[PDB]
Amino acid sequence: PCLYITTNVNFDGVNTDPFYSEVTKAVASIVGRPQNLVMVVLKGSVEIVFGGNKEAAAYAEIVSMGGITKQVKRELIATVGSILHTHFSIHPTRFIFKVF
Amino acid sequence: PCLYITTNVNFDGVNTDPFYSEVTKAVASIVGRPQNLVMVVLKGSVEIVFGGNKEAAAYAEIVSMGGITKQVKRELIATVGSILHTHFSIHPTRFIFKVF
Amino acid sequence: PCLYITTNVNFDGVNTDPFYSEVTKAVASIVGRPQNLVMVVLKGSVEIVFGGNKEAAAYAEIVSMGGITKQVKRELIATVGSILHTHFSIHPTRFIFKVF
What we know:
Distance between the termini of chain A: 10 Å
Organism (chains A, B, C): Arabidopsis thaliana (Mouse-ear cress)
Family (chains A, B, C): Belongs to the MIF family.
Protein name (chains A, B, C): LS1-like protein
Oligomer: homotrimer
Radius of gyration of chain A: 13 Å
Strand order of the largest sheet of chain A: 2-1-4-5
């Protein structure tokens, strides 16, 4: 599974490894795959507009080589949204997550 | 709905707010959603090759949380392509738009 | 067809035209379209984590305006993965390729 994240947050001088560690373990647990086979692509400093302003926001897509369930989708959106919120102060209300 | 745009145009020192204002109102009107719930992700300065050259070009994807129609797809491609053309001189012949 | 490539490889001071030339001809031959109608979007210097490390890696998506076959998908993954390997030393084991 590949989690591709695009956000307007600037990661200059930010240690993103605490995030990668938590997200990769969390996604791996949710989808039921080994943590080493979760690819994370994190692209910051991309201009975003949402809600009529440029507050911290993110768009993410996850591509899983296999079907999933409604509950797995709910858990992914909730968990990734929380981890993004906890680490980068992207509020879940400004997080759009396509689950492919 | 999230409109994710990737282009080789350089937005250094460019006021993109006139574009965000027109595109968000236009997309909102076409898909029938409030303008504040249209996310726009605009990533410039990405190398693109098309038609054998590197002239101004763009790839875009729109993710709508609901079905649409053939006419809505036509209107989105025509309208977004025009707004990109008008504001950033990306010619619609060099605009590839995936409507998810 | 549009081939959108995201990688952690840094293309500063790299001539990417040898790559564009080979990939566009190879994709065009595989999918059966003129080489001038293959768009390539190559975005480097994007942080990626896979296999628990940040070695050279890439995520790619190809959007074809028409159906394809299992064999065409196999040929695209094998061929693009090889060209990325040959030119940018991205090993195919660290190449995730979504064929839409």
